[PDB]
Symmetry: none
Subunit: 137 residues, 4 copies
């Protein structure tokens, strides 16, 4: 899953933050350091959490949000992208059972096969579940 | 069982609906998408309907006698036949299995234990999928 | 995958054919029968073609070709769908090797990650293969 | 290595290109789409170029100096950084494994006996792979 970052030049190096996550500043000197430095900052503030068993936040969907942000249009900020694998931060898998009506299951399966933004039922219902609970809106 | 569908060409593919089912339009691009997206609109609408305790539509007697239907020549349509399996739309309960991370499943539990106009996992994820698959 | 069939009301019930498949006629008495009578007509009609190691043709793609087909507005045909698993018919799965430049393989991965109508390399490259040889 | 991209708000989504790679533009709908679609346009363009033995592009010097580009403010855009690994785009061969049915496979093989602008399976499959993604 891909999270947004703003990157600013600074005199020796660059400093940046996750606009959608307070208390996540980062820095470094060559631009080749950005994503590495960033995820590490991300992971540090977050280890507070899911040693408590908390979930990764849902990543944003709307691009206009960021293309209209004044910090990018006028104050010289630069958009960047940190890619994260949830399997790495989230623990072991859990397999479990549900019951619902056939016609609903059918409806869901037919929805996934036409949308194709979804590889299976677990991914689909997991995606729907992480945003109701913890969205970055 | 057979429900007929009307299929109209559309600049970027096709356009369609069910003559027997009010409010059940579909569309797509490829040939494959005709049956697949029509059955999708059907499954969805027929989930809306029985979520809310409405009566389900039946298939018509002589589906083929839609050939002579006016709204079919008047526009430039053809007739289609989708075969739907009645077993797949029964409201019989059915058990299935999902995999996801511990963290997510714990949060779903805490959310449900707290915000409960939700008794358990199944109806939470069910209410959730209903809102999404809708249009 | 999904082949097109044309379907005609008769006095006895119905009859039809795969309009993209020469001489593959089928019929039956109720409409309940349509999907299985057509697939069995199918299964035999092309049985010759794969002792001879031919592949199933590719499901067409343009829906306009079909919507405007004379046989469907004019003579009163009814369009229908047969869904055909390629697993059976063609001999079993066989695993092999390829080489190509890392570049291109990278580009392929990303076209698949970005259009996700394909699933994986095997499905993506199989579909391209099938369509160069068959088309119509 | 970092390539700067100009990103433009479009009615439902975004629009964009790489100021250091002529002819490499991209578009999409969601935010994930941004870096994804951009690296994909890059991978495809980079393949077309070296396919036809053109000079490959190189990441510019100070990519941050682009925030002051007339091509950006005169059109309402923003600047983003895509990071790209050099290794993924080397020209050297790599081998891998594919799984498909015998009839298909041998259908290909005697399609590697006739039109021989197609010499072996890998070349054949790459030609069609190329044809497809150049679009
Ligand atoms: Cl970045
Ligand atoms: Cl059918």
């Amino acid at each position: 899953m891909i999270y947004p970052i703003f990157i600013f030049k600074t005199v020796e190096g660059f400093d940046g933050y996750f606009p959608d996550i307070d208390g996540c500043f980062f820095a470094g000197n060559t631009f080749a350091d950005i994503s590495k430095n960033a995820e590490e900052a991300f992971a540090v503030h977050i280890e507070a959490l899911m040693n408590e068993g908390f979930p990764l936040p849902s990543p944003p969907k709307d691009p206009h949000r960021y293309i209209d942000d004044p910090r990018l249009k006028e104050e010289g900020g630069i958009l960047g992208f940190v890619e994260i694998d949830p399997a790495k931060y989230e623990s072991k898998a859990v397999k479990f059972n549900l019951t619902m009506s056939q016609n609903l299951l059918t409806a869901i399966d037919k929805f996934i096969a036409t949308n194709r933004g979804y590889k299976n039922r677990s991914q689909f219902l997991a995606e729907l579940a992480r945003e109701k609970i913890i969205s970055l809106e």
